[PDB]
Amino acid sequence: RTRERLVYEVRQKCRNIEDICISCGSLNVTLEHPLFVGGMCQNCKNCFLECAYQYDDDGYQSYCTICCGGREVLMCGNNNCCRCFCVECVDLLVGPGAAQAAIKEDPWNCYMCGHKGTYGLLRRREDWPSRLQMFFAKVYPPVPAEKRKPIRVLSLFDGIATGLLVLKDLGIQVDRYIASEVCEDSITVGMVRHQGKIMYVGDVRSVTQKHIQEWGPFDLVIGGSPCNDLSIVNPARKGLYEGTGRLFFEFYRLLHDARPKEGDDRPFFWLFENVVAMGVSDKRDISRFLESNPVMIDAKEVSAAHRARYFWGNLPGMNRPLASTVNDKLELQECLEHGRIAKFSKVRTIQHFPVFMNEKEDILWCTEMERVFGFPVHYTDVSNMSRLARQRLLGRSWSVPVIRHLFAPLKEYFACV
Amino acid sequence: PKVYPPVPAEKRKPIRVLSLFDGIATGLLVLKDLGIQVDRYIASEVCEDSITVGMVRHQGKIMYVGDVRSVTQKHIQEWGPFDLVIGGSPCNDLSIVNPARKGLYEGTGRLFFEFYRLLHDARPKEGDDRPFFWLFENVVAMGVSDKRDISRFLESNPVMIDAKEVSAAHRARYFWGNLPGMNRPLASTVNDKLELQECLEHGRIAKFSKVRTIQHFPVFMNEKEDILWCTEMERVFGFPVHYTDVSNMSRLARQRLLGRSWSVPVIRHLFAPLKEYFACV
Ligand SMILES: Nc1ncnc2c1ncn2[C@@H]1O[C@H](CSCC[C@H](N)C(=O)O)[C@@H](O)[C@H]1O
Ligand SMILES: Nc1ncnc2c1ncn2[C@@H]1O[C@H](CSCC[C@H](N)C(=O)O)[C@@H](O)[C@H]1O
Numbered sequence: 292r293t294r295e296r297l298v299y300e301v302r303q304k305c306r307n308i309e310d311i312c313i314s315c316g317s318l319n320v321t322l323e324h325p326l327f328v329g330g331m332c333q334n335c336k337n338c339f340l341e342c343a344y345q346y347d348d349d350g351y352q353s354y355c356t357i358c359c360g361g362r363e364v365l366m367c368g369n370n371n372c373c374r375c376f377c378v379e380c381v382d383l384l385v386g387p388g389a390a391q392a393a394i395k396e397d398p399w400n401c402y403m404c405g406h407k408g409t410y411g412l413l414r415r416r417e418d419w420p421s422r423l424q425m426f427f428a429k430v431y432p433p434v435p436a437e438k439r440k441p442i443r444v445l446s447l448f449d450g451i452a453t454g455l456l457v458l459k460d461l462g463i464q465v466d467r468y469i470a471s472e473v474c475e476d477s478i479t480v481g482m483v484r485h486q487g488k489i490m491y492v493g494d495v496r497s498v499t500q501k502h503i504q505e506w507g508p509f510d511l512v513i514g515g516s517p518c519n520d521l522s523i524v525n526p527a528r529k530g531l532y533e534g535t536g537r538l539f540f541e542f543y544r545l546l547h548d549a550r551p552k553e554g555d556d557r558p559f560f561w562l563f564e565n566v567v568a569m570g571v572s573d574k575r576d577i578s579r580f581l582e583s584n585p586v587m588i589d590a591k592e593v594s595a596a597h598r599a600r601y602f603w604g605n606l607p608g609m610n611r612p613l614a615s616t617v618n619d620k621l622e623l624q625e626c627l628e629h630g631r632i633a634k635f636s637k638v639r640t641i642q643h644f645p646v647f648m649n650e651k652e653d654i655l656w657c658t659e660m661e662r663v664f665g666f667p668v669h670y671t672d673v674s675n676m677s678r679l680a681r682q683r684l685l686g687r688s689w690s691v692p693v694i695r696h697l698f699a700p701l702k703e704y705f706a707c708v
Numbered sequence: 709p710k711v712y713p714p715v716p717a718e719k720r721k722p723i724r725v726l727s728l729f730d731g732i733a734t735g736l737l738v739l740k741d742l743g744i745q746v747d748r749y750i751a752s753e754v755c756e757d758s759i760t761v762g763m764v765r766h767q768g769k770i771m772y773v774g775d776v777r778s779v780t781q782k783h784i785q786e787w788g789p790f791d792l793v794i795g796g797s798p799c800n801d802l803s804i805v806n807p808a809r810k811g812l813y814e815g816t817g818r819l820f821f822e823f824y825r826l827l828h829d830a831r832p833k834e835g836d837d838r839p840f841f842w843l844f845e846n847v848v849a850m851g852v853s854d855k856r857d858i859s860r861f862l863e864s865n866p867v868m869i870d871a872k873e874v875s876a877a878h879r880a881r882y883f884w885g886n887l888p889g890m891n892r893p894l895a896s897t898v899n900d901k902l903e904l905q906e907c908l909e910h911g912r913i914a915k916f917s918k919v920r921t922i923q924h925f926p927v928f929m930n931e932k933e934d935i936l937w938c939t940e941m942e943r944v945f946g947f948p949v950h951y952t953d954v955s956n957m958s959r960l961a962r963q964r965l966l967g968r969s970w971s972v973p974v975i976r977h978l979f980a981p982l983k984e985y986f987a988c989v
């Protein structure tokens with residue numbers, strides 16, 4: 292109401308659109324809107340952190356990209372776009388009745404996609420990916436090669452031992468690989484694929500500082516806590532402080548136990564992963580506890596999956612843009628087997644059945660999902676585990692080439708094959 | 709008795725193969741492993757799980773028909789002459805150890821006669837001396853009258869071949885066919901696995917030395933009685949690992965497929981002299 296009245300003074304050439312917060316109409320303009328012309332208040336910036344990369348079960352965004360609220364949104368018809376625009380924002384910044392006019396357009400393109408750049412009072416700056424990139428963005432020296440040693444890796448909430456597989460693919464010599472896990476299927480996977488070399492512990496809630504000390508020094512501590520109780524798109528979520536969210540704190544403890552003391556300058560590195568859909572207070576508390584700001588890395592650059600994840604850690608050069616390698620499969624069609632056709636160009640895991648086979652809507656294959664996530668083929672085919680269990684295992688797992696990108700400079704710090 | 713002379717190497721051509729009750733396309737995989745050029749590989753099968761296996765593993769090359777009872781002599785003729793016909797009809801309506809069995813002429817036992825028909829239709833006529841070969845498989849444990857009736861129909865006595873000598877599995881099977889020198893004793897190759905323990909993954913121990921498929925859970929894992937793994941069972945039966953991991957089929961379905969599937973090195977042994985009869989890669 293008040294915001295709508297203000298926008299009146301904006302179009303009467305009495306107020307600059309760049310001087311008003313186009314999300315909620317607050318006067319406390321501090322930052323500029325990264326996607327379009329206008330200002331942004333701090334409160335809306337926090338809302339913008341949570342809501343932009345939230346997707347519903349249909350594979351489209353949960354909320355409007357502009358105001359990061361809205362009660363009824365317009366979905367986008369154009370290929371590979373997942374954005375939504377709430378009716379209210381469209382009926383202000385573009386013009387009155389433009390929203391219902393977009394409702395009636397059966398082949399409709401949203402304003403983020405359409406070829407033209409000017410749309411009424413709404414203007415889109417062309418540098419929005421780079422500004423968005425920067426918006427979401429004790430140093431050890433290099434060790435000389437002869438002094439390099441095999442890496443020792445602790446992987447908490449190890450899952451299917453993706454980290455050891457990545458280090459093997461990079462040809463780094465692994466002295467030992469200790470892994471905490473509770474799911475029998477996931478325990479089996481590591482044993483088989485890595486030939487018994489993986490020391491399986493059990494419940495991470497049994498792991499003491501004494502255990503960590505007597506297991507010998509660790510060179511790399513890695514992990515991803517369960518995201519079911521952190522991800523905001525779960526209505527029944529218990530947050531960071533209840534249910535399975537609190538396993539992150541156990542990770543924080545064992546990382547603290549595994550970190551060298553001050554004055555001991557031996558090389559040590561860590562990587563923690565979580566979903567982008569994590570709450571403002573949850574994300575803030577995690578970011579404060581790990582004493583760093585997260586780097587946001589999207590799988591779509593190197594892994595042909597729309598999987599935007601936060602990575603806390605101290606791996607060197609982890610800000611540098613992702614450079615694809617020829618080995619990597621940037622296309623979903625370059626991962627499916629012959630006779631199957633990809634609906635979309637990227638799979639969505641944070642149409643429901645993204646396969647066209649024999650003019651029929653088929654579901655995603657487990658092995659094709661393996662190839663998408665960058666795992667060497669038939670990695671999770673070890674025991675007599677259900678399709679549901681293998682799907683859940685691949686879903687919770689890391690994107691392999693993203694982990695290869697992050698782990699890549701560790702080759703300059705430990706012994707290589 | 710019609711025995712074909714050896715074809716000289718320059719005249720050799722790619723093999724044309726009809727595989728009825730093809731299952732998971734074991735025959736094409738063995739011919740490839742033996743390095744015989746395959747012009748075509750037509751396969752009849754009806755279960756989706758098995759259908760997917762061949763498609764993925766052999767890159768669409770396999771011409772799928774479907775129901776064997778939909779395959780006519782006209783179809784066989786327009787699909788061009790075949791050089792090798794292979795197959796194994798359903799075996800647990802023949803096995804005496806299933807009380808509800810229907811024998812050879814009832815239920816699924818009678819499915820062999822379709823194979824017998826299409827084999828006859830695919831066979832060259834008398835006076836046409838072009839090379840042609842066939843191989844049919846079944847379980848040893850069938851009825852004596854059953855075995856006799858099959859022996860009468862296929863105009864040969866079965867060879868009994870046990871898998872365990874070359875495949876570390878108790879799978880004693882009858883093999884009808886007219887492959888040259890198919891009576892010769894089984895030879896072992898270093899590539900082949902003769903010990904169940906060798907097939908098992910690290911941390912697991914084999915109770916027995918040979919599995920029994922024609923203690924019920926023959927695995928020692930972590931001082932516990934575990935069941936057979938499908939990937940270890942594949943390594944037992946001589947298949948390349950992860951052969952059947954193609955679609956969204958249950959572990960029960962994969963077990964059923966590997967149970968009904970051929971022992972690979974036994975079929976490889978029988979297929980071995982075909983290298984002296986067709987073109988090489
Ligand atoms: N209390 C607990 N103790 C040890 N592991 C647990 C646990 N609760 C959940 N987990 C395991 O931790 C995993 C976190 S999902 C992360 C999987 C892993 N990062 C990968 O790449 O595969 C889950 O698979 C779950 O099986
Ligand atoms: N009526 C029918 N028409 C076509 N195929 C059939 C059929 N009835 C059964 N089959 C298939 O024939 C197979 C016989 S079991 C033999 C499988 C194959 N010889 C192998 O070694 O893998 C079964 O897997 C079954 O799927």
Ligand SMILES: [Zn+2]
Nearest residue numbers: 312315332335
């Ligand atoms: Zn605001």
Ligand SMILES: [Zn+2]
Nearest residue numbers: 355358377380
């Ligand atoms: Zn909006």
Ligand SMILES: [Zn+2]
Nearest residue numbers: 367372401404
């Ligand atoms: Zn769009």
